[PDB]
Amino acid sequence: MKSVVNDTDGIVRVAESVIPEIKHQDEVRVKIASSGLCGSDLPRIFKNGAHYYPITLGHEFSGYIDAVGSGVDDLHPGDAVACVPLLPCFTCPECLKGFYSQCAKYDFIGSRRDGGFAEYIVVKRKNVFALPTDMPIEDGAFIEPITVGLHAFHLAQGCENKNVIIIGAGTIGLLAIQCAVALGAKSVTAIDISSEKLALAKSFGAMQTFNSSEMSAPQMQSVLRELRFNQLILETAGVPQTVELAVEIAGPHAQLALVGTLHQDLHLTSATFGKILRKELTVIGSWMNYSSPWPGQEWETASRLLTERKLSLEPLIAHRGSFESFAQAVRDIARNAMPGKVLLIP
Amino acid sequence: MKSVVNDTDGIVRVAESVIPEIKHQDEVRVKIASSGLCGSDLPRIFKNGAHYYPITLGHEFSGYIDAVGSGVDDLHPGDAVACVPLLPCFTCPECLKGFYSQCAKYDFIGSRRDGGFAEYIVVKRKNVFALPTDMPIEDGAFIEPITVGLHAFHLAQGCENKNVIIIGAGTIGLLAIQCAVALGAKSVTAIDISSEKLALAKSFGAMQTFNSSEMSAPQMQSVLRELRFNQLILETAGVPQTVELAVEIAGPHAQLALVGTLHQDLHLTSATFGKILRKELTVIGSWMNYSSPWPGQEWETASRLLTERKLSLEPLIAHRGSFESFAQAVRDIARNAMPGKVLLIP
Ligand SMILES: [Zn+2]
Ligand SMILES: [Zn+2]
Ligand SMILES: [Zn+2]
Ligand SMILES: [Zn+2]
Ligand SMILES: [Zn+2]
């Protein structure tokens, strides 16, 4: 079987190895139909970090069950499934309350482990989610990134009838916009520094857009005045300025979902911190994309949205193709400012 | 009649005046029986603080109705009342939704207008709260500071069955410990730099205490391992070190209630910020102490807790006395802060 696997930075192109076999009673073998390249998995791509180089990443994929272990009785060869990349222990106190993302002894396909840039992969039954037969199988690669946004909505007890504001017009943010619209948000606002990404956001249903390199927070809040109640704000950009921005624009009692991780420190003036208290904001930390019963309602919702064709994925796709046309992957538009998702389609 | 008048630069003085008359149909005149000094006034005395000078502070008092205006139906001379010092406009969109503390055109007794360090005061009907006639009237001066902690509990949807952690053992925090014990927290933990204040906290029912000048956040989080679920953390100290501390010790999905205002900027590492997300904390900004119906459930609860005598106020009282043992007692703060509450009794 062919594959796409890397090591200490700078190398790739395509490899060739033996098909994995089921080695445990609760494993399945998946024949991969679609597997996508994410920004999380990125800067191990050459930004290093020990880890064992060895082996490669890839946690956003779908395909069909090829074989199941002697202990698997709820899945058969040919069943459509998507990857559920996290593997919690399922038995610790955090796991028993459905806090899978707070499990101390986690595991992760395409990170801790390895994931799916190959024709086949063997994983635990718990790491696959059965898909509707009516779901286009290649859109299964988007379920995991869709659930990132849905899990924030879930933590905020839903986006329905709320004035949703998405900060950051990356793939996750763009999917959140489409989901918010599909899920009955009163309104959807997108904020980003790129006018092209905002144009994309508007085509996805964001009724208005703010360019944060052109508008100040006061100007934004002024325009938001009609929509200042029942806000649900998603910070997806993961930069200090946009966390600060979210607090400054926020209406009375807004919910503020933090989905983006920071890599720089956050400096809040006394004034800005004071606004958290004065507006009585609720700031909600969001981590990964799971809830109980495992893997969570987010996965059902994403699945449902994708089968009933509520989402537009083509504009989020920078590339489709088989191994040869994906061994491609890496070229040199540099390592990022990514157009969009890059798909492997065996 | 006498009063306590604050001028600029720490100047405190006792003055003579004429008894105030009712000048509007919706006003009442209160015969003041007990009136206390708040920590937020301390900046308005020794560090500029107040929005005008000279000023009579004092938003923490109780008394008896002396007279009512022609438009007051539901109060009569002789009724015990506590001061409700905020006056929202009651007509703006925020106010209509119960967001009184987000009213933009607020009045405030002992801040925007002169307060109750005085023998009599005239205020709007809306600025008094009828007290049970079998509440000790002097304890009325504690209702407003009790409602601060109760408002934070309210924003977190209750402290019942939760492991609450009070950070900061000042008067606000000490009352919050007692309320949590009275309201049925699963456990109460207190955190402060003073071993004596923590001993005081323990005597109020905090069944364990952490001295943050001796224990690090990891040491505390380790002791808290058994109580790590369903935490409700109140930050009352209003310094950046304790906001950072609250995030570092917090268990999975803890609620963090921000009560203390910062007067320093807040600089948080990416790592501390990451923990908000990774732990999926919920951070709740708390402002003032009101809710609907005006002035809110908090006031009704503070009042019940006092009439039921569930709270212990004497170890909170640093000073009683008339207008100039009071004046000089305030003067003796100057340098630092309060050992405990200072009260004026006629
Ligand atoms: Zn990811
Ligand atoms: Zn676990
Ligand atoms: Zn800084
Ligand atoms: Zn106060
Ligand atoms: Zn108002």
From Swiss-Prot, chains A, B:
EC number, as in UniProt: 1.1.1.251
Native species: Escherichia coli (strain K12)
Protein name as annotated: Galactitol 1-phosphate 5-dehydrogenase
Keyword line: Galactitol metabolism, Metal-binding, NAD, Oxidoreductase, Zinc
Family statement drawn from the similarity comment of this UniProt entry: Belongs to the zinc-containing alcohol dehydrogenase family.
GO molecular function, one term: galactitol-1-phosphate 5-dehydrogenase activity
GO biological process terms held by the UniProt record: galactitol catabolic process
Cofactor-binding details, from the entry: Binds 2 Zn(2+) ions per subunit.
Keyword Repeat part of the UniProt annotation: no
One Pfam family in the UniProt entry: ADH_N
Gene3D superfamilies: Medium-chain alcohol dehydrogenases, catalytic domain, NAD(P)-binding Rossmann-like Domain
Gene Ontology terms: cellular component: cytosol
Annotated residues for binding of Zn(2+) 2: C89, C92, C95, C103
UniProt-annotated binding residues for Zn(2+) 1: C38, H59, E144
Lineage: Bacteria, Pseudomonadati, Pseudomonadota, Gammaproteobacteria, Enterobacterales
Alphabetized CDD domains for the sequence: sugar_DH
Annotated gene: gatD
Record-linked InterPro entries: ADH-like_C (IPR013149), ADH-like_N (IPR013154), ADH_Zn_CS (IPR002328), GroES-like_sf (IPR011032), NAD(P)-bd_dom_sf (IPR036291), PKS_ER (IPR020843), Zn_alcohol_dh (IPR050129)
